[PDB]
RNA sequence: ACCCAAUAAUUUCUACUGUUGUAGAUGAGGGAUCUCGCUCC
């Protein structure tokens, strides 16, 4: 197996050695900012864009159908549903012309609609919390940290700038008043304010604020800067409008009297100041002055709904006559007469389909119905010449905004550009570390000049390094690169080279290809080839020359493979002095490259990250066309320091003092690049997904792991063997026993409880961190004692283990080792959190004074709770089929002890549908209980339990040696008692949940990469891994809505583990994946490289050796066919992992059926 | 002098914790048979 390209974000610590220049922007970034007035403006912004979007019509307010979007949007928020809809039209071949003047709009696309509300409503509820945030009346921190976290969750690319978007790229063709000239306008304020308020209310995010970018090819930074103020003047002015040329401006031949009513109705807004102009321009925040665009649409519009309004009257034609519409009061008494007998045939055809019976006939008379009217409008934009006029005119005006519009958009979009890239990039090494230089903007072309006069490279301990990198993109838009605006010096150069029209004509843009890639590839290739692109280009010409140039390649891929892999370069020069001359000269600035590690000798070990950009250096990797990468664009961030407790020194640490971060990106395995994967049709999915699986073979799998599925604290892992597969019950027991053979080893502490003390005088505990005392090293220097001493309490302290299964939630990985309780504070800190989470959302319900009462009962003691319990852990849609009876039945059946009722296998078989998740509730592990039904002391009867019953807590067996047991019972009262005196944000409370959750994750992640890995070593094959469920697929709904969901986490982050080690397709996010094909089949199975999932089939507690019996409280199997747990698994809740791993590798082995 | 009993060596988390610190984990779903326009539902 052969990896992947890669690519990893990477940090680094900065400091300040000479920074003058830089430090200016950071001056000139400070900003202003007012809550309130924030608040009202986002509220009435919002309040009025549902105006724009939703249509009339109580009975279902929705989106109406008819709005117009660009393909731009769709591109950036919506890639599934633009491939859908492509594919749709593309494969039906509704294409007959292999070009056409296409127009679409929403309702076109399916369930566009949904989304687009699902984020309206988002969007909302937003604004809501913020509005009580601002109204609120906590703890001054508090509110700033709330706040902070408001803006932060507002301001993601899901949110705000995707409405704007929308706005931005959308257009009504029924428009009445000029609402969307005010949205439009409104959009740059809201988006300002939004930055300030970012800017203000959160100095203190751990990766800092953008300040500046840099790169290291001298393509991008040479651009000199462009007078775009005046150039936008210049454009600007070409939208003033006489308003009496404006008839002058097209053919059409208006009658007197009617060009007079065009004229009136324009003249007035002759008033008040009010300058017509052409179109509009948004991007100066135009206002007062009145679009003549917009103007021609109202009159359209309401002289559209008039005649509407009349031919559904059925009014005379005299009438006609006399009526204001100037545009259509001019047809023929015979083509309104034509007019009018379409209209009621139409009223018929109505009449008949409300009369419909059946499905079919009402559809027949439907198309009916639209064929009339199709003949209506034909006639009716056929016949009305005045109409046609109308029209025409309006078409002749309409695309002169447009194309002003588009260059106005592109110098912005230019300048915008400009603005970033302040920095030439380059790296100096010293003494075995590496500091980073800026070079300013415009000393360029002089550093370059001096650089290339330099010395070649010298063994010497002070060296300079530079780039230079070439990639199909980089390429495109130095070819392509905003040409509009003629700006584009090189693009210049190349003129001569590009396709020409029939009529001569220069086509100075890519569409002139028409997507033949056999055209753009000998088109690169002379750019390429091309004298002038040498100058201004370096790259190894003598390679090029045979491996790109003199070639061919069947696709646009293997050529852009094939770029990417050649064109990268490194020099390196030497000379005395460079540091101070470079500063001296060329006002270069200076940081310092550190470390925690970089800093010490003590080459013992390394952190992950820092084995990549050590090993970029090393002269091998030069040799290897660089295996390892680096990109050549960086950012810089700044970050402030957090500091508001009061003073009594405390210690240093980071957040103590501002600090400048430094990010990159790095690659990896460079040589082997591999089309990414992305949204894309199911078909091309299912084909290329199945096509990497079949690079396995049935016969090289050795091993599979199953890991369980659960409640919130994650649960059992388990491994499976062939070899299993006995024929005789007696034989396959006797294999099992063989555990000393199959079996891994682990650890574990004896004593939670032991303690020692350090010279210093600290006590230390093992609980709070065994590396302390695993590690010999460690023990040695902390506690002085010898060799032997060490050796003695090691063997004393510790236990050794030969296991199948393990309990995956307290696992960690200590220097080579498993410890199974490794580590307790981590997920005591989760349940601790988790039920004070709950506890905090139920009294946040229930603000109304009568009967508050939350009672921590630890017990059901009493039915109608009982029935809400099960309601709350059951499928609604399973729930709802059940009668009081079966309900009570489902109730016992959770409660009541297995044996006490003979449950019909029906019942069963009903029941376990039901419930999300199996666990005891009753007798084994104790979990309190909340209701808040109680107003008065509890009856069977009445007190009714709409106030709801929650599952809060869970005792481990252990409890802990942290804290004490009487302790933690007055904890969890007290949180719900004094609410007053905890001062934390509901909406804190749940990052500092994600953390935990998101933390914890990485010890599994850890256990689980080790175990494969010493199973392969040993085997020398390939293992399957089995997960039960396919869980990122759902909704996420509720509590979980910023929670996390951690089996969803555990199935990213593990995924993204494996992709390093090339056993999973290239699949760059797991959202991509068509998981429907799962449900409901106990033979199915779904396979990705390695990986697989199965469904959710129920079959805990089964017998892993007579599939009949069931295993509840004693080691030995009831059924009497010798199976035993305790001299293999740690407990019999190991069981269901071995099941799943079972099941799984049989399903993996049934798929290649008829495949293999 | 007990309640706003909280915080705490890191590129950054989580446990811990003070001057050779220790254990495990660790990246970013944005690109050209164009662009911008007009009927009718």
Redesign the pocket.
């Known amino acids: 197996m052969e990896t992947y390209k890669?690519?990893?974000?990477?940090?680094?610590?900065l400091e300040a050695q000479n920074v003058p220049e830089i430090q200016k922007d950071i001056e000139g970034l400070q900003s202003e900012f007012n809550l309130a007035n924030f608040v009202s403006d986002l509220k009435n912004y919002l309040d009025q864009v549902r105006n724009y979007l939703f249509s009339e019509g109580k009975e279902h307010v929705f989106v109406n159908?008819?709005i117009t979007i660009?393909?731009?949007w769709l591109?950036?928020?919506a890639?599934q549903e633009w491939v859908d809809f492509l594919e749709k039209n593309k494969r039906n071949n509704s294409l007959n012309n292999?070009?056409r003047?296409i127009?679409m709009?929403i309702?076109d696309f399916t369930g566009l609609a949904s989304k687009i509300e699902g984020t309206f409503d988002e969007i909302n509820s937003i604004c809501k919390g913020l509005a009580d945030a601002a109204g609120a009346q906590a703890?001054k921190?508090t509110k700033r940290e709330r706040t902070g976290l408001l803006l932060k969750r507002l301001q993601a690319?899901?949110a705000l700038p995707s409405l704007f978007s929308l706005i931005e790229n959308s257009?009504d063709?029924n428009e009445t008043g000029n609402l969307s000239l005010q949205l439009k306008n409104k959009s740059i304020l809201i988006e300002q304010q939004l930055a300030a308020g970012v800017q203000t209310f959160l100095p203190a995010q751990?990766?800092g604020l953008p300040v500046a970018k840099a790169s290291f090819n001298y393509y991008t930074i040479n651009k000199k800067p462009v007078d775009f103020g005046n150039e936008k003047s210049e454009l600007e002015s070409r939208l003033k409008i006489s308003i009496d040329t404006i008839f002058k401006l097209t053919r059409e031949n208006f009658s007197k009297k009617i060009e007079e009513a065009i004229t009136a109705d324009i003249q007035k807004e002759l008033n008040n100041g009010k300058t017509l102009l052409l179109g509009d321009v948004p991007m100066l925040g135009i206002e007062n002055y009145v679009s003549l665009?917009q103007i021609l649409?109202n009159i359209?519009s309401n002289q559209?709904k008039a005649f509407?309004d009349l031919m559904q009257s059925g009014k005379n034609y005299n009438e006609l006559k006399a009526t204001n519409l100037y545009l259509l009061n001019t047809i023929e008494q015979r083509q309104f007469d034509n007019y009018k007998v379409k209209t009621n045939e139409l009223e018929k055809l109505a009449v008949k389909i409300n009369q419909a019976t059946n499905d079919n006939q009402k559809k027949e008379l439907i198309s009916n119905?639209?064929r009339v009217?199709?003949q209506?409008?034909?006639i009716?934009?056929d016949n009305f010449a005045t109409?046609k006029s109308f029209?025409?005119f309006?078409?002749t005006?309409?695309?002169?905004?447009?194309?002003i519009?588009?260059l106005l958009?592109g110098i912005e979009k230019e300048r915008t550009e400009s603005q970033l890239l302040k920095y030439w990039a380059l790296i100096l090494e010293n003494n075995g570390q590496h500091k980073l230089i800026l070079i300013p903007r415009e000393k360029a072309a002089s550093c370059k000049q001096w650089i290339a006069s330099l010395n070649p490279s010298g063994d010497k301990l002070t060296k300079l390094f530079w780039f230079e990198s070439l990639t199909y993109?980089s390429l495109?838009?130095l070819?392509?690169?905003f040409?509009e605006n003629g700006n584009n010096k090189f693009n210049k150069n190349i003129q001569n080279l590009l396709p020409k029209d029939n009529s001569r004509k220069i086509?100075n843009?890519?569409?002139?290809?028409?997507?033949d890639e056999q055209k753009?590839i000998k088109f690169y290739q002379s750019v390429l080839e091309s004298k002038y692109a040498q100058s201004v280009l370096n790259i190894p010409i003598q390679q090029v020359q045979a491996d790109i140039i003199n070639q061919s390649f069947a696709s646009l891929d293997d050529f852009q493979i094939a770029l990417e892999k050649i064109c990268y370069r490194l020099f390196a020069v030497v000379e005395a002095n460079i540091e101070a001359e470079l500063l001296k000269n060329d006002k270069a600035q200076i940081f310092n490259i550190?470390?925690?590690?970089?800093?010490?000798?003590?080459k013992?070990?390394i952190?992950?990250?820092?084995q990549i950009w050590k090993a970029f250096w090393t002269s091998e990797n030069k040799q290897n066309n660089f295996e390892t990468r680096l990109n050549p664009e960086i950012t810089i961030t700044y970050?402030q320091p957090?500091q508001s407790?009061?003073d009594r020194s405390?210690?240093?640490?980071?957040?103590?003092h501002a600090?400048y971060?430094?990010?990159t990106?790095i690659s990896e395995h460079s040589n082997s690049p591999t089309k990414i994967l992305?949204?894309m049709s199911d078909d091309e999915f299912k084909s290329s997904v199945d096509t990497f699986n079949k690079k396995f073979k049935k016969d090289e799998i050795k091993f599979a792991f199953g890991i369980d599925n659960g409640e919130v604290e994650l649960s059992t892992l388990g491994v499976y063997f062939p070899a299993f597969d006995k024929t005789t019950y007696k034989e396959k027991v006797a294999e099992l026993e063989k555990v000393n053979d199959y079996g891994f080893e682990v650890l574990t502490i004896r004593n939670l409880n032991y303690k020692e003390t350090?010279y210093?005088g600290?006590?230390?505990?093992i609980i709070?961190?065994?590396?302390?005392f695993l590690?010999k090293?460690?023990y040695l220097?902390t506690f002085n004692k010898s060799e032997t001493a060490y050796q003695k309490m090691f063997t004393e302290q510790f236990e050794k283990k030969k296991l199948l299964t393990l309990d995956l939630t307290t696992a960690?990985?200590?220097?080579?080792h498993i410890v199974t309780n490794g580590?307790v504070?981590?997920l005591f800190?989760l349940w601790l959190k988790h039920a004070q989470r709950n506890i905090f959302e139920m009294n946040d319900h229930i603000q109304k004074e009568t009967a508050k009462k939350i009672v921590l009962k630890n017990q059901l003691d009493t039915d109608n709770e009982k029935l809400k319990f099960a309601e709350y852990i059951s499928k609604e849609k399973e729930f709802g089929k059940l009668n009081d009876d079966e309900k009570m039945k489902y109730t016992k059946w959770i409660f009541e002890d297995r044996d006490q009722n003979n449950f019909t296998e029906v019942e069963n078989k009903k029941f376990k549908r039901c419930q999300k998740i199996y666990g005891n509730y009753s007798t084994k592990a104790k979990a309190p209980v909340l209701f808040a039904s109680c107003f008065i002391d509890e009856e069977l009867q009445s007190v009714t339990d709409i106030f709801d019953v929650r599952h809060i807590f869970k005792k481990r067996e252990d409890f802990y040696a942290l804290?004490t047991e009487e302790?933690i019972k007055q904890?969890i009262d007290s949180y719900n008692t004094?609410r007053?005196?905890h001062?934390?944000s509901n909406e804190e409370l749940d990052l500092?949940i994600l953390?935990?959750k998101?933390?914890?994750?990485?010890?599994a992640?850890?256990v689980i990469?080790?175990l494969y890995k010493h199973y392969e070593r040993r085997l020398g094959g390939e293992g399957l891994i089995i997960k039960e469920g396919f869980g990122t697929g759902k909704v996420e709904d509720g509590i979980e809505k910023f929670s996390g969901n951690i089996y969803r986490i555990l199935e990213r982050?593990l995924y993204?583990?494996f992709q390093?080690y090339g056993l999973v397709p290239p699949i760059?996010?797991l959202?991509?994946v068509r998981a429907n094909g799962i449900e409901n089949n106990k033979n199915a199975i779904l396979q990705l490289g390695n990986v697989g999932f199965i469904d959710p089939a129920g079959t805990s507690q089964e017998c892993p050796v007579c599939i009949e019996g069931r295993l509840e409280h004693t080691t030995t199997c009831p059924n009497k066919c010798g199976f035993n747990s305790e001299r293999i698994m740690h407990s019999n809740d190991g069981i269901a992992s071995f099941n799943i791993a079972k099941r799984g590798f049989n399903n993996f082995v049934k798929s290649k059926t008829d495949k293999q």
Not at 510 to 515: K, S
């Open positions: 890669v690519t990893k974000t990477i940090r680094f610590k159908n008819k660009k393909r731009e591109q950036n928020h890639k292999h070009t003047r127009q709009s309702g703890n921190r690319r899901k257009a063709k751990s990766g665009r649409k359209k559209k509407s119905k639209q009217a199709k209506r409008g034909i009716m934009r109409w029209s025409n309006y078409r005006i309409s695309q002169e905004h447009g194309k519009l588009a958009k993109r495109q838009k070819c392509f690169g040409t086509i843009g890519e569409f002139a290809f028409q997507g753009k550190t470390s925690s590690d970089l800093r010490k000798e003590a013992d070990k952190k992950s990250h820092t970050r957090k407790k009061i405390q210690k240093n640490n980071r957040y103590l600090q971060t430094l990010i990106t992305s949204f350090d210093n600290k006590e230390r505990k709070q961190n065994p590396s302390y590690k090293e460690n220097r960690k990985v200590i220097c080579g580590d504070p981590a800190n804290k302790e904890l004094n007053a005196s001062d934390i500092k953390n935990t998101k933390a914890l994750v990485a010890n992640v850890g990469d080790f982050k993204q583990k390093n760059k996010s959202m991509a």
